[PDB]
C-alpha cells in the first residue's frame, strides 16, 4: 500500500543516551546491512519529512525513450550500378551503450516495448535535382520469416508481418510491442550454452556461444524507401527510440564499470582502468 | 538462558550434518527459501522426479588452499555438483532440472590469524573471456570446471594464439570477473568470513532463473565467488597457509523428461 509518491518516514526527536543498547555496533559478516537513522547515533529534533521517492521507482527510471539503433537506407538513380540500400537490423538493446547499462542493473526483466521512429533524409550528390516526399516501410520480420533479399521482392507484401508506412515530414513513428519473451522473464545475462557437446559427437557439432540463448531472439526489422528510383540520390537515416514500459525487474547486479565489448560480458584491454588517482588523506 | 547462540549452528540434510561454533548467522538469498514447483508455475507435463534425501544432502568439494598470493576462486551451480552421487546421476538423466542450494564455506584459523573472505552468490555469474579478438569465445570445457572449479586473476592477459585459442575465462578479480567494480559485489546475497570473528559462510539459495525449470546441463543458475577482501596474514611469517572447504547441498530438486544418460564432452 505504500506508493511511490509517499512522504518518507519522519525524523523523530531523540535526546541524550547512556544505555546497554548498541545501535552503533554491528557485524558485516552476517551479510546484513545495519539499519540505522540519524537519531540512532546523534541527538535529533523532530522533522516532518517532505521528500518522496516518487521518481526513483522502477517504472520511472526507464520512462525515457532511448536510441537503440540507426538504420540507413537510400534511394539511388535508376541507371546506377549499386543496388538501392535497404537495411536489416537484428533487434537488440545491446548495440548502443546507454540503455543497455540501465537494463543491466538487474538480472531479469519484463516490459511492454515501445519503439519510436525518427527518420531524416538528405541528398548526397552535388546537383540541384528533386525528390518528392519519401515514404518508408518498416517491416518487422519475426524469427524464421522470409527476410527480403531485394528492395522490390515478394517479401514486402507483408500479409502477416506488422509494418508501418511512414510518410516523411509527419510526426515520428510509433508502435507497441508487448512482453514477447519465450521465457518467464527476459534474460540480460545467460550463463550457459545453447548446445551440449556430447562425447559421441564431434566437438564442432556440439559447440556454441557463451552467453547466448537463441541467435534469433526477437527478429529483424527491415526498412526500405517505398518510392521508386529517382534521378537524384537521396539517403535516409531512421533512428529507433525504445522506451520500456510496464517494467519489472529481478535481482540487482553491479553496474558495468568498464566499457562494453561485444554483446557479451567480456572486456577489452586498454579500458581496464575506471577509477582515477586520489590520495588517501586528501579531501 | 539455555545458551542459544548465533555462532553455534547445526544444519542437517538427509544423512549429513554440519555443525559450527563460530558462525555469523545465516543468509537466505532474497529471503526466499528453496521450494518445489507449484502447479501455478508448472511447465513440463510429466511427473517430476524429486530425489529428496537421495540428492538433498551436503556434498564436499575438494579443498582449496589460501595463501597471500591468492587472488580468488569460483564455481558454478549445478555445474560444481555434476559428479556428486545421485544428484549428478539424476542430473544427467533428465532434460530439465531445478534446484536450490545450501552453500556452506569452511575456513578456520587461529585468533592470531587475520584476513577476510567474501563468499558471493551471483545468479547467472557470467565471467569474461580471454581474447581481444573473439568475444564470448570460452569453450564449454572451460566454462564448466566441475568440482575443482576456477580462480580469479590479478591481471588481464589477452590470449594471442589465434592458431588455437585457449578459450577460457580470464576473470579479473577487481572487476568481479565481469566488468564491474568488486566493491559493488555486496548487492548479491553474501557473507564475509573475517577470521577474527567467524569461521564459516552459509548461503541458502533458492532456484533463480527466467524459467520455472531449465536444462541444467546447458545452464548454470548460481555462481559462488570467493575473493580475499583482506589478504592473509599470520604472525611475522612469510608463507602462511590455511584451507578452504566447500560443502554444498542441493535442495528441493526436481527433474523432468527422463531419457538416456548424457555423457558430456568435459575434456
Amino acid at each position, epitope marked *: 500500500a505504500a506508493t511511490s509518491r509517499d512522504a518518507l518516514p519522519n525524523t523523530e526527536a531523540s535526546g541524550p543516551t547512556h544505555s546497554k543498547e548498541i545501535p552503533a555496533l554491528t557485524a558485516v559478516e552476517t551479510g546484513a546491512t545495519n539499519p540505522l537513522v540519524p537519531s540512532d547515533t546523534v541527538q535529533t529534533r523532530h522533522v516532518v519529512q517532505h521528500r518522496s521517492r516518487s521518481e526513483s521507482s522502477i517504472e520511472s527510471f526507464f520512462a525515457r525513450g532511448a536510441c537503440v539503433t540507426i538504420m540507413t537506407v537510400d534511394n539511388p538513380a535508376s541507371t546506377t550500378n549499386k543496388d538501392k*540500400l535497404f*537495411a536489416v537490423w537484428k533487434i537488440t538493446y545491446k548495440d548502443t551503450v546507454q540503455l543497455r547499462r540501465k537494463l543491466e542493473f538487474f538480472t531479469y526483466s519484463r516490459f511492454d516495448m515501445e519503439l519510436t521512429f525518427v527518420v531524416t533524409a538528405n541528398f548526397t550528390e552535388t546537383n540541384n535535382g528533386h525528390a518528392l516526399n519519401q515514404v518508408y516501410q518498416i517491416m518487422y520480420v519475426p524469427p524464421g520469416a522470409p*527476410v527480403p533479399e531485394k528492395w522490390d521482392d515478394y517479401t514486402w507484401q507483408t500479409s502477416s508481418n506488422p509494418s508501418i508506412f511512414y510518410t516523411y515530414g509527419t510526426a515520428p513513428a510509433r508502435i507497441s510491442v508487448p512482453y514477447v519473451g519465450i521465457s518467464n522473464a527476459y534474460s540480460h545475462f545467460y550463463d550457459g550454452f545453447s548446445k551440449v557437446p556430447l562425447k559421441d559427437q564431434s566437438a564442432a557439432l556440439g559447440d556454441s556461444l557463451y552467453g547466448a540463448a*537463441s541467435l534469433n531472439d526477437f527478429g*529483424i526489422l527491415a526498412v526500405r524507401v517505398v518510392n521508386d528510383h529517382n534521378p537524384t540520390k537521396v539517403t535516409s537515416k531512421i533512428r529507433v527510440y525504445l522506451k520500456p514500459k510496464h517494467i519489472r525487474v529481478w535481482c540487482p547486479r553491479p553496474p558495468r564499470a568498464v566499457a562494453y565489448y561485444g*554483446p*557479451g560480458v567480456d572486456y577489452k584491454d586498454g579500458t581496464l582502468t575506471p577509477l582515477s588517482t586520489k590520495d588517501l588523506t586528501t579531501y | 538462558a539455555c545458551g542459544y547462540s548465533d555462532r553455534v549452528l547445526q544444519l542437517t540434510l538427509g544423512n549429513s550434518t554440519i555443525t559450527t561454533q563460530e558462525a555469523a548467522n545465516s543468509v537466505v538469498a532474497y529471503g526466499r527459501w528453496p521450494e518445489y514447483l507449484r502447479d501455478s508455475e508448472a511447465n513440463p507435463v510429466d511427473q517430476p522426479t524429486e530425489p529428496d534425501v537421495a540428492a538433498c544432502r551436503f556434498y564436499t568439494l575438494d579443498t582449496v588452499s589460501w595463501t597471500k598470493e591468492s587472488r580468488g576462486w569460483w564455481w558454478k551451480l549445478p555445474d560444481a555438483l555434476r559428479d556428486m552421487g545421485l544428484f549428478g546421476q539424476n542430473m544427467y538423466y533428465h532434460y530439465l532440472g531445478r534446484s536450490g542450494y545450501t552453500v556452506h564455506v569452511q575456513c578456520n584459523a587461529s585468533k592470531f590469524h587475520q584476513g577476510a573472505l567474501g563468499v558471493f552468490a551471483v545468479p547467472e555469474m557470467c565471467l569474461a573471456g580471454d581474447s581481444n579478438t573473439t568475444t564470448m*569465445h570460452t569453450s564449454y570445457q572451460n566454462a564448466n570446471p566441475g568440482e575443482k572449479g576456477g580462480t580469479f586473476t590479478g591481471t588481464f592477459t589477452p590470449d594471442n594464439n*589465434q*592458431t588455437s585459442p585457449a578459450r577460457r575465462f580470464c576473470p579479473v578479480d577487481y572487476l568481479l570477473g565481469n566488468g564491474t567494480l568488486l566493491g559493488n559485489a555486496f548487492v548479491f546475497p553474501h557473507q564475509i568470513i573475517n577470521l577474527r570473528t567467524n569461521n564459516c559462510a552459509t548461503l541458502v539459495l533458492p532456484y533463480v532463473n527466467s524459467l520455472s525449470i531449465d536444462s541444467m546441463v546447458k545452464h548454470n543458475n548460481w555462481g559462488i565467488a570467493i575473493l580475499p577482501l583482506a589478504p592473509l596474514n599470520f604472525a611475522s611469517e612469510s608463507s602462511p597457509e590455511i584451507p578452504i572447504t566447500l560443502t554444498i547441498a542441493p535442495m528441493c530438486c526436481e527433474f523432468n523428461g527422463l531419457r538416456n544418460i548424457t555423457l558430456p564432452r568435459l575434456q
Partner: nanobody
Amino acid sequence: QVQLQESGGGSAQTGGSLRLSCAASGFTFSHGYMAWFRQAPEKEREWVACVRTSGVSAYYADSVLGRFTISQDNAKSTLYLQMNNLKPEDTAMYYCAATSISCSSGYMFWGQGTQVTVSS
C-alpha cells in the same frame, strides 16, 4: 541487404584445388561465426566448416578434414575456402553461410551458391 555472394567456380579434374570465396556486406555483427555448407547433387544439405567471427579458430567436417581450408579476411570482409585434393564425393554445390551461427547450425543469411565438379 547483407549481401552474401559466392565465387570460386567448379570444374576441376580429380585431385586438384579451388578457391571458394564469399563477398559479405550489410551488417555482419562480427561476433558469432561464419561458415560453409554444401547441398550435394542428391543428398541433404550438409555442414562443411565453420570459422569464428574474426578468430581463426575453426573446425572441419569429418568428410573434408584437412582437405578443405576455411579462413577469413575481415579487412576485406571476406571468407575463403581453399580446397585441396578434390574428389568424386566433393562434387557438389557450396554455400557461404556466414551469419549469426554461434555454433554450426543457425542462420539468417545464406548465399546463392555455386557448383563444383570434380571430374574423372
